[PDB]
Amino acid sequence: PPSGYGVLLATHDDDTVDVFTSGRKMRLTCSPNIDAASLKKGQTVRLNEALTVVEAGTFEAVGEISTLREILADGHRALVVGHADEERVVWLADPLIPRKLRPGDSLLVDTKAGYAFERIPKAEVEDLVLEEVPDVSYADIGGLSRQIEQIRDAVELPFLHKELYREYSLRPPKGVLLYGPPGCGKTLIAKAVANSLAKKMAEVRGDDAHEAKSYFLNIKGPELLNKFVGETERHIRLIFQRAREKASEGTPVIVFFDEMDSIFRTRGTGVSSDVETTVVPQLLSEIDGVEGLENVIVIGASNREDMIDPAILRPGRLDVKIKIERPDAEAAQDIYSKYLTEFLPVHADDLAEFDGDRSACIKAMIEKVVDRMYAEIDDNRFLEVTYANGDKEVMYFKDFNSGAMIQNVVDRAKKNAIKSVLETGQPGLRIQHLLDSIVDEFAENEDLPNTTNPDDWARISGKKGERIVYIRTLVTG
Amino acid sequence: PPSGYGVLLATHDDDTVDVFTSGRKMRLTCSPNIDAASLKKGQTVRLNEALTVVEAGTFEAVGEISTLREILADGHRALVVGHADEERVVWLADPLIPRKLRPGDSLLVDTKAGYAFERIPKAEVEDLVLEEVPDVSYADIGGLSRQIEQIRDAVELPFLHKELYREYSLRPPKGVLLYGPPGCGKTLIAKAVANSLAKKMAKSYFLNIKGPELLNKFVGETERHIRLIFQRAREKASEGTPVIVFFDEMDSIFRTRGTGVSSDVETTVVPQLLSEIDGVEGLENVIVIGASNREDMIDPAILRPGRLDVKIKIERPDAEAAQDIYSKYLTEFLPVHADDLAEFDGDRSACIKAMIEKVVDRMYAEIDDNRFLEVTYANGDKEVMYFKDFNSGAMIQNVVDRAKKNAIKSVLETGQPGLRIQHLLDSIVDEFAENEDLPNTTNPDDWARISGKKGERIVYIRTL
Amino acid sequence: EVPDVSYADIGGLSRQIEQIRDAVELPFLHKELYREYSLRPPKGVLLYGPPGCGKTLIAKAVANSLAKKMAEVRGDDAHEAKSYFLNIKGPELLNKFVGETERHIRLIFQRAREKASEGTPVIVFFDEMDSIFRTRGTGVSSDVETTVVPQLLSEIDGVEGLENVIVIGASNREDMIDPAILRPGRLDVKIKIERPDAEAAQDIYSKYLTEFLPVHADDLAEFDGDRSACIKAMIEKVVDRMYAEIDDNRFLEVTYANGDKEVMYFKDFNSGAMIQNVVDRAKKNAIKSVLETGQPGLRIQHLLDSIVDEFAENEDLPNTTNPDDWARISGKKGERIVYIRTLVT
Amino acid sequence: GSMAQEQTKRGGGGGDD
Ligand SMILES: Nc1ncnc2c1ncn2[C@@H]1O[C@H](COP(=O)(O)OP(=O)(O)OP(=O)(O)O)[C@@H](O)[C@H]1O
Ligand SMILES: Nc1ncnc2c1ncn2[C@@H]1O[C@H](COP(=O)(O)OP(=O)(O)OP(=O)(O)O)[C@@H](O)[C@H]1O
Ligand SMILES: Nc1ncnc2c1ncn2[C@@H]1O[C@H](COP(=O)(O)OP(=O)(O)OP(=O)(O)O)[C@@H](O)[C@H]1O
Ligand SMILES: [Mg+2]
Ligand SMILES: [Mg+2]
Ligand SMILES: [Mg+2]
């Protein structure tokens, strides 16, 4: 049978309720089947041709998004403004009396019915902060065991043992700063953290899909900056409001500021841009202000620690400072082992001397590669550096080795092996291919040096005691 | 006979549907002729006087158009903004749920019904990000065979047999950086490889963006322009087809993030690009190709292995490369002098080849007739740098154009339809009568690099 | 939520708490004497100093005290008690449209003047007003402050002025603050928060190392179970180690424009936040040891090596002698410092 | 050689029903 719908306004003990439909409000009685006490405020009902309330339900449909301004004294009505700066009070529905409401929260309203049904999540945050879960895990990271343990203890440990922390009256750190030379790996650690966080909530909690996406708000560095006044501050405030409302008792929320070395500026610096004076104080007030966050972790990745404002690096805002160093020999071996797995096509001639023991052959190849790469020979001499004292110091390729360089060398060796397979026809991977790839990679970076190169002065001049003033390429030709 | 129309909202297990008609929502029952299972959300339904659905057609093609803001987590609703900044949370029809909708997409909606029917393509967004069809081929480029081989290996091969790469677990290259002296043909190689990849597929898309075009008076516009460019690239590559993004003249924008220019906004533009290449979100089928005659001025963070890992150095053409370029720009169909044609007995190819050989022999000589510059180094040794060390491809093009202009003058003065070898020979020496921007100030960076190659710092430059 | 902190949770600041009480609580506790002497409460309060030294701590402690006073005076409703403290949170007033931030400021101040009842103060706290505080000519990217500052300074004092509203500002860059707003009659009380000394460090450690924290039995063995004596001895040892002129505590070498050389230790760049972080790191080490070995207890060596771990973590953060705190020492020497080098290993 | 930030000025607009 054909029937219409209406919006319930109030319930009375006379078994009669007020329903708004067809643009007018009428007081109608309910069917015997339905229970008056079961009905709630702000939920829809289904009428009939005789106007008999037969079915209940909830309202989920379209509506003009209204900005909530304040909550009245009675607590059941709310003041909202519309697109045309029209202010009006509306009865709050049952599901809004959930997190505590705040001024400026978007609400779904029906002007004719005058009821606010739900809070729409802010669009300026969700459409951008969320990202797809990377495949990188802690297993796929090598040579940074101490850093991995430290970041684990800073992020995941406090929430696994909540009672132990409560007994000592300790709280999780309010900020982590990852820093180091380029290519040593910080976005990889961020990927591992994001993957671990997604795994923790998708299975151990098992709430629903896409919920793991909601956590770990990832924001690129300059993307918050925009051409307006107060827009960046509005974005920051919306981000932190979302983080605060998504942070639960023991459930953490991670805000990752990629490329924090240039966190919108260094305050008191920048001839071309002066946005620091308005963006830095907002972030400084959001973190460790008059009202402080409870279970929100701020993680930043930087390549120039000096270019970050000092007031944000002090303890209480970015507590745990994790430094990633360029790999040494043992770390280089681990990094190579992270890529040269026992599943690559291995040449039969290279396995001839190992009697088919692929793992031993790979280990020996890794050792040979490391020895070649870290050899102190004239072939490995890259640059000479002159300082204020003038002492000419030699710098090899080992001083610029990184996990990215190791991956590039391995990929180039794989490409050379594929070329050999295509041309000659013999399948497999050869150690000589790795050596040729190393030689080509080292020779391809002869044009990198310039008059000045950062990311190494803070590590060289500290021991040397004098600033780098001259750089020369060594014997070539 | 008369029958109305309505908008379907949802289906129920009781074989009942919700229909929006005349600005009101009603509960209806499908007719026995139609099947309730086949119904889809947002589909137009034909009603009758008895308020019974009897037939369902296609979706409405007219109404308002709104800008999409976000997609709600429930997967059945979307927040959009109206013409007057009015915000509506509207249902998504079945067709909406190519690539998934992104913020900024235009949706055909009707506010009273509250449904989004169709994604409406916009010409302005397509025009903002240009996608031309390159036509330059590998044939048009001569004297750079090994560089063409390298760029084929770094681009063409990974997509020719990508299944082999997956078997070998090899990651296709993500960045190629062409560098060298100016005028050596940096853009031609990129255009040629783009055209070859377009012909190879049997579909690809190519994005070309210049340097200064990514500069704005305000702050926060270049970064969002880069973000939009990479979003377009990701949208095009989501289908699996490779996408090439070419940055032209990277020397001007996103220089060294350190001191660099004493007053520049560069410090806030390079990291964004970095975050677009290496980050928590990783692009899959996007290749970034950059060309800059000043490789030392590029940001070392961009030049880190993994981003622009492939590095190709173009060098100034030698005598054989000059002959190749001349052969490329001199065809058999080109008119030649009657005397030369009679000497070669109609063998036009031999005539043009011999003329090219004579021209390239004239250009490369140590005689004091082709003196170009005088260079005095730190040791004080004076050396005459002739044209042999500055034979760029654009210079060859200018030589050919000047020779053709001289041929036009000769044919309009005498009337004989032919081209003389003496025309090109005179154009060789007339090329440097007018500046070609090869000479520069006291201590140029190119001459500093040349001195570093030589081993003694160049201090004095004199025109000859 | 009003912060749970109280004045008893702030250590090393004795004169400053007295001043902040005299500015706010005293005029309303003794209205009769103020009327007799024809004295009115100070119009503005200013807090400044190195970051992490406790400005926001005082700002929230005074808010908690005001909330308690209003609860025990007017009524037990939480909202009315909390409504007498206003939070700005920085550049919240800035808006895209022209002339809207001024309207927001005017609304705020008119509501503040309507709220006061000559016995109930209204407190407006500008958290990190360095954004609004600008010299009207230092702008490079935008000059919205050229419009914001006149409106605020005219609202504060003018032909129509506020009577019993206290404006509290907290800042870290005092130089960037506009000279006009740094005037008697607008910011009467200039409270300066200084980095803790030895006694202040001991007081802060006592505030954080409470006697209720579990202590290892071996530590209590020396004092035979006297928890307070053991804890105070540990605090004394920790503050002695941290405030010691040892070759391992050398931090930075400072060279001025005139050429004077100064050796600065880690104690120079110390704050209450650093002490709290050291205590938290020691507690983290203790709980990790408890998990690994199965025995409870916080030891002294945990504090001793947490100190060196923290000092090593923050051992290298210099940047082209940015005058965050170098201005004062440079003025003492005579010329601004230009050269620095890290003394590590 | 400096960047700017924009402040908008809303224009009058009104509709009926
Ligand atoms: N254990 C490891 N240590 C270092 N690098 C690794 C390791 N494992 C893998 N890598 C490789 O190193 C490359 C660079 O890592 P990553 O992107 O984190 O550097 P980054 O910190 O982003 O550099 P920058 O800060 O200069 O952008 C990655 O592509 C990754 O494949
Ligand atoms: N094989 C070749 N080598 C070099 N130049 C060539 C070759 N073939 C043609 N040219 C000419 O070189 C000119 C420049 O080519 P291209 O645009 O690739 O470099 P470019 O970007 O102009 O160099 P620059 O960076 O100095 O501007 C073209 O006009 C073309 O006619
Ligand atoms: N007596 C004390 N002196 C200084 N700091 C203390 C004291 N007691 C505790 N602290 C800690 O110092 C930290 C920082 O203090 P507060 O937030 O008041 O200043 P701040 O806001 O960091 O200063 P700024 O805004 O300049 O960074 C607090 O988290 C608090 O736990
Ligand atoms: Mg990174
Ligand atoms: Mg070009
Ligand atoms: Mg503060």
Numbering used by the authors:
A (entry chain F): 97 to 193, 211 to 590
B (entry chain C): 97 to 193, 211 to 315, 326 to 587
C (entry chain E): 245 to 589
D (entry chain G): -1 to 15
Sentences from the paper on this structure:
Proteasomes are present in eukaryotes, archaea and Actinobacteria, including the human pathogen Mycobacterium tuberculosis, where proteasomal degradation supports persistence inside the host. In mycobacteria and other members of Actinobacteria, prokaryotic ubiquitin-like protein (Pup) serves as a degradation tag post-translationally conjugated to target proteins for their recruitment to the mycobacterial proteasome ATPase (Mpa). The bacterial 20S proteasome interacts with a ring-shaped AAA regulatory complex called the mycobacterial proteasome ATPase (Mpa) in mycobacteria or ARC (ATPase forming ring-shaped complexes) in other actinobacterial species. Here, we use single-particle cryo-electron microscopy to determine the structure of Mpa in complex with the 20S core particle at an early stage of pupylated substrate recruitment, shedding light on the mechanism of substrate translocation.
To improve the local resolution of Mpa, we performed local 3D classification and 3D refinement combined with signal subtraction of the 20S CP (see “Methods”). This approach resolved two states of Mpa at an average resolution of 3.8 Å and 3.9 Å, respectively. The two states correspond to two distinct motor conformations stalled at sequential stages of substrate translocation. Based on the visible side-chain density, this tubular EM-density can be assigned to the first 15 residues of the Mtb Pup sequence. A stacked pair of residues, the canonical aromatic pore loop residue F341 and the highly conserved adjacent lysine residue K340, forms a spiral-staircase that encircles the Pup N-terminal segment by engaging in unspecific interactions with its Cα backbone. Another channel loop about 16–17 Å further down (V384-S385-S386) forms a second spiral-staircase. It is resolved only in four of the six protomers, the other loops are flexible, as the Pup N-terminal segment has not yet reached far enough down at this state of engagement. In state A, 5 of the 6 protomers of Mpa are in the ATP-bound state with arginine fingers contributed by the neighboring subunit. The protomer with the pore loop at the bottom of the staircase (protomer 6, cyan) displays weak nucleotide density corresponding to the ADP nucleotide form. In this case, the arginine finger from the neighboring subunit is displaced and moved away from the bound nucleotide.
